[PDB]
Amino acid sequence: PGGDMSEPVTQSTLRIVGAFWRLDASLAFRRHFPAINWNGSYSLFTSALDPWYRENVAEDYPELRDAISELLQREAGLQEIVQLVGPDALQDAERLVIEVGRIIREDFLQQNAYHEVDAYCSMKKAYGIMKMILAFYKEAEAAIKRGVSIDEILQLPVLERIGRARYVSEEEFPAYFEEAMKEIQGAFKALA
Amino acid sequence: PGGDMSEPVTQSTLRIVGAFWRLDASLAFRRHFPAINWNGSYSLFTSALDPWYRENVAEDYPELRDAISELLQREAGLQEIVQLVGPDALQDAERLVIEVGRIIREDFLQQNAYHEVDAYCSMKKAYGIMKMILAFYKEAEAAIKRGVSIDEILQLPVLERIGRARYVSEEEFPAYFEEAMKEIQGAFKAL
Amino acid sequence: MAVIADPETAQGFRLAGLEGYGASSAEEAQSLLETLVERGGYALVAVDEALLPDPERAVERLMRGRDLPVLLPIAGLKEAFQGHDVEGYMRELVRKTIGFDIKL
Amino acid sequence: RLMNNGVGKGKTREDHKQVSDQLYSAYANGVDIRKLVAIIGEDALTENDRRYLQFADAFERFFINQGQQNRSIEESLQIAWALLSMLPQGELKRISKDHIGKYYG
Amino acid sequence: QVSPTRMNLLQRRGQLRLAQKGVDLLKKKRDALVAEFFGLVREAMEARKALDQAAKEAYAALLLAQAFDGPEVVAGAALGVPPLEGVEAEVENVWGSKVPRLKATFPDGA
């Protein structure tokens, strides 16, 4: 009733249950549907569901699932001096961490549930979106090590590609994921 | 019993009484009598005593009472900032508001019931004191938005006149009030 | 107004009128700086860049009295014919301010 | 909690929820901008937050402070637009472009 | 401590509410000071760079002036110049804090 999480009903429920999916009101006010906070939510069924993942989703799936959790922890880590200092006024690595966390939030986690083909999302499609975002980060980081500036890698036609890759029908996504991976590797070899 | 007004007696009194008056104890440790707490006391009869006031006291008396209550509300709003940041790191206008609220609580609210003068204070004297303090406040804020220092405002010989204006008698009071208004224009004429 | 910058090129600062001192030894320059913050040399001391990076810490130790003697790192002349590294100087000033390597 | 089903197309007017949310956010920061102004002043602001302070100080004297006069939904919405016209054009972020281009000023 | 009644529970809720508002108030104050700090830092580096350009001018002129003439003529001249005194520091009282800004007196045309 008071919105506080120390009453014995919530306390006894969080002792009993195995997954807690903390909805917040602030994310819906920032227009992020589903409004589920990832910084307070927690599940305990990952380690039990790892061999099912390796036999039915893909072999390397928990490692890049851990990578996405690492990125969304570093973003909310350095968020304080994001607010204090400025958006662009960080360094070349930390602002790229900000932008890959932002493309995670507005491309992977955010989901228009009323849409025709955005509502349902299987494991192969989530693995594909995850591998696109992580390949973007793991090549843009060495790219900003080698020779490029932070604005030349952002504005690029793989960003609209990744950003609209969730609007792909489930049969079409195998005939789209490989082309997107080829073109992100080509657009990072060319100049980036 | 415990000094706490969540009792079953007090919460059954304050639903049927009008004009409920909390006396606190922290304004009573320092001897500030009567110790009427203003943050939590109320009176509901102010909307049916308007024509009586407007005939038997003055004409602008409800608006002057509302000026007092609005200025004390701004004072008790800024007491947050003055208990948090400090008396400095505040502007000159809000320091004016805090000092004028303090001289209201020391020269209009405080009243000792053992002195010969200032026990029975009929409301002509109370209207006089409020009109003194509001003329002081309006010309002080006009002077402070023209721009002078606040320490050359708050060391006048005219707010001591306001501070002693409640120890003077009822009998010769309106001539003293006229002299106080003449000095209250002639002390901001000079700045 | 006083300087501790150079052995001989402080004579140009004396030729400006404003007084000063030069020693080319760090500790006698800091000792004349000490008698210059005791006998306050009219509120400005300009100290050489590539002899004292931070002149202010020893002076605020030996005088917790107020910052009327202002202390600046003034540029050495020889390094002035190289390039000031204005950017890196503001980097170290902002990192002396808030610790962060944030770049405006 | 039951305003979404209450106002809108054919219920009162189409701009109703957006006027509501914009007025709520503008008064929400117009409150604590007075808390900021308490310790800083009226010159070390922006122009934007100064204009928000004037919006809050006129909001709580024309919109809330009704008295016992009678206000319809039409006159209340046009007083709401006249108060929102104190804000700069284009800062009305929670309103779509047509209602701004039709009812401003 | 305080002896717990139903009054002090609401008084401590009020004190907590005031401190929770004060944290956000001081964060807004820190944001305004960040804005003014990034205001002044580019002006400081601009004035520093102009000081560097006038430094190149003055050092080249001083080397060439002691060069074409002797060192002794500019030595006796510099030991002849009046000390240019009375330079002092007046008020910039802001944030309730007087910082001393500096102005000179400059006997120059004589």
mmCIF file with all atom_site columns, C-alpha atoms in Angstrom, chain A residues 81 84-85 89-91, chain C residues 98 100-104:
data_model
loop_
_atom_site.group_PDB
_atom_site.id
_atom_site.type_symbol
_atom_site.label_atom_id
_atom_site.label_alt_id
_atom_site.label_comp_id
_atom_site.label_asym_id
_atom_site.label_entity_id
_atom_site.label_seq_id
_atom_site.pdbx_PDB_ins_code
_atom_site.Cartn_x
_atom_site.Cartn_y
_atom_site.Cartn_z
_atom_site.occupancy
_atom_site.B_iso_or_equiv
_atom_site.pdbx_formal_charge
_atom_site.auth_seq_id
_atom_site.auth_comp_id
_atom_site.auth_asym_id
_atom_site.auth_atom_id
_atom_site.pdbx_PDB_model_num
ATOM 1  C CA . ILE A 1 81  ? 29.344 11.529 -13.712 1.00 0.00 ? 81  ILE A CA 1
ATOM 2  C CA . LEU A 1 84  ? 27.487 15.673 -13.530 1.00 0.00 ? 84  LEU A CA 1
ATOM 3  C CA . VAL A 1 85  ? 29.956 16.196 -16.367 1.00 0.00 ? 85  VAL A CA 1
ATOM 4  C CA . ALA A 1 89  ? 32.469 15.395 -22.283 1.00 0.00 ? 89  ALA A CA 1
ATOM 5  C CA . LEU A 1 90  ? 33.581 11.890 -21.151 1.00 0.00 ? 90  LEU A CA 1
ATOM 6  C CA . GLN A 1 91  ? 36.441 10.061 -22.840 1.00 0.00 ? 91  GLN A CA 1
ATOM 7  C CA . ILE C 2 98  ? 37.835 17.524 -9.050  1.00 0.00 ? 98  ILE C CA 1
ATOM 8  C CA . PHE C 2 100 ? 38.394 13.532 -12.878 1.00 0.00 ? 100 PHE C CA 1
ATOM 9  C CA . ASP C 2 101 ? 40.059 13.380 -16.286 1.00 0.00 ? 101 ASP C CA 1
ATOM 10 C CA . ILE C 2 102 ? 37.075 15.168 -17.834 1.00 0.00 ? 102 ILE C CA 1
ATOM 11 C CA . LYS C 2 103 ? 37.883 17.415 -20.728 1.00 0.00 ? 103 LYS C CA 1
ATOM 12 C CA . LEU C 2 104 ? 36.391 20.822 -21.382 1.00 0.00 ? 104 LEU C CA 1
#
